[PDB]
């Protein structure tokens, strides 16, 4: 794998007002793991699902607040949201980052665009209770 580096001495916002939102299909679990890739094979997807209208600069934090509106039990402080992108190679996975509710974390401002999300991909969220 070739590698690129740059002098560290930026990313830009979407004008959401002038841009049609994309349709994100979001799948979720509460068993402690992501959906398996066999669950996306042969033209099938997982039954646990949410639709989110958003933009390429959606952040994990923004996405976590939408999930919380819909799963009231995800509300509790310390609840863990682990995010993955599911993408056509059949499908594959790549964990991208995590958040938790009521807490600031280092991945909170990570955006779909920074992770090379391409439209057509799915988002998978493994949800776990507070420590």
Name the residue range of residue 72's domain.
1-131
Measured distance CA(25)–CA(23) in Å, rounded: 7
Number of structural domains in the chain = 1
- Residue 91's CATH number: 3.10.20.550
Residue 55 to residues 46, 106, 117, 119, 121, Cα–Cα distance (Å): 23, 21, 11, 10, 13
Say which DSSP state 69 is in: H
- Listed resolution, Å: 1.9
Measured distance CA(17)–CA(68) in Å, rounded: 24
């Amino acid at each position: 794998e070739s590698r690129v580096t740059q002098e560290e001495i930026p990313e830009k916002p979407i004008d959401r007002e002038k841009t049609c939102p994309l349709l994100l299909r979001v799948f979720t679990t509460n068993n402690g793991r992501h959906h398996r890739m066999d669950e996306f094979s042969r033209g099938n997807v997982p039954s646990s699902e949410l639709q989110i209208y958003t933009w390429m600069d959606a952040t994990l934090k923004e996405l976590t607040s939408l999930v919380k509106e819909v799963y009231p039990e995800a509300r509790k402080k310390g609840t863990h949201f682990n995010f993955a992108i599911v993408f056509m190679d059949g499908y594959r996975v790549k964990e991208i980052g995590s958040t938790m509710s009521g807490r600031k974390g280092t991945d909170d401002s990570m955006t779909l665009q920074s992770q090379k999300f391409q439209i057509g991909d799915y988002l998978d969220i493994a949800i776990t209770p507070p420590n």
